[PDB]
Amino acid sequence: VMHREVWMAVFSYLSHQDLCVCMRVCRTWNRWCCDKRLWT
């Protein structure tokens, strides 16, 4: 939840396998994690 720009900063420190876990946490996180720049 909370603010989106805060969470993308932390998400950018996560591997592909770490990011794999976060799209099942909540609905808003799943939408946030479909940004292709995170899997760079």
């Binding site: 720009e5 805060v6 900063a9």
Partner: protein, 81 residues
């Protein structure tokens, strides 16, 4: 009618570099009006804008003449959540 400049800082959580914009204002105009004009130009609602001139935080209900904001002066603006 008069022209003033508003300059941002670097905001890393957004991806914004410092930059300056121009506004058309009146000395009578309230800080609430100027924030409304800033939303008009860049889409930032007032609840996320803090404007500063001469190391004084500009309060919403007051005017630019109350801070002696004149032609070509420059306000700085921090973005908050």
């Amino acid at each position: 009618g008069m022209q003033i400049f508003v300059k941002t800082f670097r905001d890393r959580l957004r991806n914004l570099l410092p930059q300056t914009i121009t506004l058309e204002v009146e000395p009578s105009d309230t800080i609430e009006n100027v924030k409304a004009k800033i939303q008009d130009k860049e889409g930032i609602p007032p609840d996320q804008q803090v404007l500063i001139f001469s190391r004084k935080r500009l309060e919403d209900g007051r005017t630019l003449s109350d801070y002696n904001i004149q032609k070509e002066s420059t306000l700085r603006l921090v973005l908050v959540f």
